[PDB]
Design a protein around this nucleic acid. Structure first.
Ligand SMILES: [Zn+2]
Length: 252
DNA sequence: GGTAGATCCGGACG
DNA sequence: GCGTCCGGATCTAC
């Protein structure tokens, strides 16, 4: 799930788990658990805690419990579901949080690629994976000035910069390509080559693109198809180690 | 210390 | 058809 979908999960999951008390934690693929390093300690520490809140930072979900925060990343295919402990588990279920009311929060992921970290709540923001995370794209903390400051001091491409989690939180490959198209900026442009005008326009389109999605694609996955603006075939390359989609006429 | 490379995974695919 | 690819983000090494 991309940031907008992660926000939907945050909003929808919260009422389904708030006020429930963890009775057991069952782990079927311990490598998902990144902190504490021992998955047995991860399970043990969560028992007896009640779910109090659910927040989002970039694409991370932060489950707030009594003493601890659980920080979860679903990557591309991870999913959460609340269901009865009496029913058979779905395939690829790697972690289950069992509540005292006979319901469960289940984590599933065909790719087995997601991560979970648990720390005392007051520690979570200063440890991985939240430590160093950049500002929310929809917050005033993410501004043209902030983007310009990062752009001038790097030799990297503009796409590489937007994909950097320390620059802006959880802006995915899809939104990077869509925002660059909407801004009329080539993904391989050096970040430092962008004018003040271009930085402003890029910030504007990043906010509009992600904001529209939180509340329909021009280029992403559309290689070989006509640009919706000018009819030129969309092209695909590799930029910053990612599949990269752009209109060679409209982007400069 | 900025930045590239390695790493984790398995469905899709040559 | 069995090796290659690929996404995010963090860790490791230049
Ligand atoms: Zn075009």
């Amino acid at each position: 799930p991309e940031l907008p979908e992660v926000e939907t999960i945050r909003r929808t999951l919260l009422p389904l788990i708030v006020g429930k008390t963890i009775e057991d934690v069952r782990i079927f693929w311990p490598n998902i658990i990144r902190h504490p390093r021992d998955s047995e300690a991860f399970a043990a520490r969560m028992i007896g805690q009640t779910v109090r809140g659910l927040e989002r930072r970039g694409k991370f979900l932060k489950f707030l419990l009594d003493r601890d925060a659980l920080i979860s990343h679903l990557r591309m295919e991870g999913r959460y579901a609340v269901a009865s402990a009496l029913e058979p588990l779905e395939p690829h279920t790697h972690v289950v949080f069992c509540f005292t009311d006979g319901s469960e929060l289940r984590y599933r992921d065909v790719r087995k690629f997601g991560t979970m970290h648990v720390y005392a709540k007051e520690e979570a923001d200063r440890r991985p994976p939240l430590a160093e995370l950049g500002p929310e794209p929809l917050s005033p903390a993410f501004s043209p000035a902030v983007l310009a400051e990062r752009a001038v001091k790097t030799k990297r491409s503009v796409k590489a910069l937007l994909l950097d989690c320390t620059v802006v939180a959880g802006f995915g490959n899809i939104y990077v390509d869509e925002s660059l198209f909407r801004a009329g900026i080539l993904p391989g442009r050096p970040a430092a080559s962008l004018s003040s005008k271009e930085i402003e326009r890029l910030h504007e389109e990043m906010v509009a693109t992600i904001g529209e999605a939180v509340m329909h694609l021009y280029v992403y996955g559309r290689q070989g198809n006509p640009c919706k603006r000018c009819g030129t075939p969309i092209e695909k390359t590799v930029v910053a180690g990612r599949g990269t989609h752009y209109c060679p006429r409209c982007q400069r």
